[PDB]
Design a binder for these strands. Structure first.
Lengths: 133, 117, 55, 27
RNA sequence: ACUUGAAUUACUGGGAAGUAACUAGAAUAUGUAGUGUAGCGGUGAAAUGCUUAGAUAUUACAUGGAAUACCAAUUGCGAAGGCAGGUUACUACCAGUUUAUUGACGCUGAUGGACGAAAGCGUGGGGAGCGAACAGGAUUAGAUACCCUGGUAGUCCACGCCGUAAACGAUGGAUACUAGCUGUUGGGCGCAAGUUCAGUGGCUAAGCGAAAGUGAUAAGUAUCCCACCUGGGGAGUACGAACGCAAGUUUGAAACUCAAAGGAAUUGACGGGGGCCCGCACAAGCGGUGGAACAUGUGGUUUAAUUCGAUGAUACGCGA
């Protein structure tokens, strides 16, 4: 009986002029601080310049996109868009467990394509079991 | 030891809690059997189209490498899976030529057992 | 019996709908349990009365 | 009518029945 | 004295109407033989149970018991209980009609006789399935139950015994009158329409009824006969008697206690009844509390006093 949705339109960022970076830093924000989140993301993607650009980050963001979730524990597809919010949430949630020094340092999990693919593998292994529904 | 001449049947006996597929020669000698509970589906999912399909495909490409090409499937009993027990045999090699249903119905023979509350 | 001669999905759907039409998908769920005449004779006087009042 | 009136006549006929059963084989 | 009531006879029919004897198929169970390997069965999920000593599954044959899918139903028959696969024999009953026949031979019916669901009892067989009691598994705080796996009596047959039911249409049997509409069963008259008897359902007018309802198959208006009722509990109890192998059946009080029990309908309330909707109510996401130290509030314990009040949602950083 919510009867509506608005999807909350967004606005792109100056660097990389991309619309996914804005969603990523929005999920990265804490206590309503966007500037420091952008700073941390930029330091992280520049630290990732060891090995290309944010292309490798956005492709690593694909390996954490599940195709079916269990929610009598019935499996079902999630949505064509909630996939890139579960992927971002899982990446950001499991990048805060790395025992590195800084946030930009422990965010170096895009090259681990490492606690991010494990979640998708467990989801697929738990969804392929309850396939008779 | 049993002759596997290329004319046979597939007895699909289903019920309210399981299903059993048996590919059999044209003389009654069973060649290869399979069951939903046999295919690691122990629980309330034995009576499901996916379980029936897996149980059928288990024995399909087992009796296939024996000399069986044409089947005269006999279906018996109620329950789900009668569809995707012939679907995933005709879609897995061996070809079906009949869908004869031989579900037994008594003509007021015996007393049904004590309607359950 | 329900012998049906013979794509495969078309013939399978034909067989399934013939099986649902011949009145058996609900004939065995009635024989799974025991219905004594004292209860099988009221489902007629409560059905005929409904069909009559629906006229 | 109401069932409360027909009630208690099951208990009055069950207690007597159980008493007569428990008083059998007495001699 | 008469035929209109009643009964008999003649012709057309009618049915799961009875008793006895034969016979058929599907299905379940068991056994033998062939094939074949790891499960089968069960539940809201599990376990007990059967299985590598070859189960479940499939084919062929054999054995045995009970009940008769479709037809099949507000159908039909029977006084009621009740009666359902098919065939025969021995009976019984009913309806219509051109007959012929006797002439009130009729209705009801206390004592009484007969029949009388299921369960139960005795003797002798049979026993496939189901299954009281009972044994395990499961749920629960407990489960002597619901659920699951087995299972004795019984259910069946041949002689008997008891005579009880929500044995209900909760409406005794007759006869005669009083509006219609609409199906259906078996007859008659009909080339069809349709009409008239005998049964079986629904709507409804008048009329009855406290109302629900009934309403030509009356709970409508009359007459005859039988049974029963007189506040609730005690109580269908106590005592005596009759019947029965027994279980039990029939008849049937009193002392004592209360001012109430009871039927129909109305408004609200409620339901682990149904239908349609709403709310950060739930589903998703974020941040918390409950963990640690500090501040106030309150309960509790002490004090000469620890001022008073709210101590669920609607009190507890409240009056202040």
């Amino acid at each position: 009986r919510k009867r509506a949705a608005k999807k909350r339109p967004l606005l792109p960022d100056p660097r990389f002029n991309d619309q996914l970076v804005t969603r990523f830093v929005n999920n990265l924000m804490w206590d309503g601080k966007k500037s420091t989140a952008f700073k941390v993301f930029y330091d992280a993607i520049d630290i990732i310049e060891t090995k290309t650009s944010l292309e490798i980050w956005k492709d690593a963001l694909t390996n954490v996109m599940p195709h079916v979730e269990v929610r009598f524990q019935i499996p079902m597809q999630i949505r064509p868009d909630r996939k890139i919010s579960m992927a971002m949430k899982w990446l950001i949630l499991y990048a805060r467990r790395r025992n590195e020094k800084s946030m930009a340092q422990r965010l170096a999990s895009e090259c681990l394509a490492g606690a991010a693919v494990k979640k998708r593998m467990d989801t697929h292994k738990m969804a392929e079991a309850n396939k008779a529904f | 030891k049993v002759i596997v001449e290329s004319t046979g049947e597939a007895h699909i006996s289903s019920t309210f809690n399981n299903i059993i597929i048996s590919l059999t020669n044209k003389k009654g000698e069973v060649i290869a059997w399979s069951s939903a509970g046999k295919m690691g589906f122990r629980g309330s999912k034995k009576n499901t189209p996916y379980a029936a399909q897996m149980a059928a495909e288990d024995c399909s490409k087992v009796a296939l490498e024996a000399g069986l090409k044409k089947v005269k499937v006999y279906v018996k009993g109620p329950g789900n899976g009668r569809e995707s027990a012939i679907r995933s045999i005709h879609n897995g090699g061996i070809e079906v030529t009949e869908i004869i249903d031989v579900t037994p119905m008594p003509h007021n023979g015996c007393r049904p057992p004590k309607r359950r509350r | 019996m329900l012998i049906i001669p013979i794509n495969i999905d078309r013939a399978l759907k034909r067989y399934k709908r013939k099986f649902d039409k011949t009145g058996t998908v609900r004939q065995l769920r009635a024989r799974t349990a025991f219905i004594k005449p004292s209860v099988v004779k009221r489902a007629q006087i409560q059905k005929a009365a409904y069909i009559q009042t629906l006229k | 009518p109401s069932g409360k009136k027909r009630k208690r006549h099951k208990v009055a006929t069950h207690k007597r029945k159980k008493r007569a059963r428990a008083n059998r084989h007495k001699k």
